[PDB]
């Protein structure tokens, strides 16, 4: 999990790799979350798939190639590159003294919900990919954080070697 929106809603366009086939299609649990599995309507490689219907109490979501034929890509590579920069560090973290086995589940998203992807808009993390190449680029990095700004997590998240962007 890296979103706080527990069920990904309509026209969320994700490319989860196909895992295990079904008699309708393939039971594919999306790697975006942990406990969300799916469907394909009419071997092991990923593909651009949109999501159509939704439930609430039962958790079963569904997804296929509805109408999305000519679609440009680079929004989706931006999607899962930002979504893969946030696993090894940025789900649990701390005011970082990383326990590395797990951190607290109810003190989990005390600042990470407001700064990475579930912000004000889609141009929210658009601007967080435009200005913040990293916070190293430029060296006049942002204010307005739950921390001072990043005073313990500055060295430890991205600013290690070059922040290559």
């Amino acid at each position: 999990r890296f979103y706080q929106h527990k069920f990904p809603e309509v026209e969320d366009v994700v490319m989860v790799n196909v895992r295990s086939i079904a008699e309708m299609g393939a039971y594919v649990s999306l790697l975006e979350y942990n406990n969300i599995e799916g469907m394909i309507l009419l071997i092991g490689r990923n593909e651009c798939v949109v999501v159509i219907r939704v439930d609430k109490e039962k958790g079963y979501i569904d997804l296929s190639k509805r109408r999305v034929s000519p679609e440009e890509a680079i929004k989706c590579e931006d999607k899962f590159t930002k979504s893969k920069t946030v696993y090894s560090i940025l789900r649990h973290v701390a005011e970082v003294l990383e326990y590395t086995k797990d951190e607290q589940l109810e003190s989990l998203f005390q600042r990470t919900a407001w700064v990475f992807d579930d912000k004000y808009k889609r141009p929210g993390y658009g601007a967080y990919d435009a200005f913040k190449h990293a916070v190293s680029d430029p060296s006049i990095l942002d204010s307005l954080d739950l921390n001072e700004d990043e005073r313990e997590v500055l060295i430890n998240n991205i600013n290690r070697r070059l922040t290559p962007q």
Binding site: M24, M39, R53, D55, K58, Y60, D62
Partner: peptide, 10 residues
Amino acid sequence: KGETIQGLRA
């Protein structure tokens, strides 16, 4: 009525 494609079916 569960009213979904996959989960109902399965």
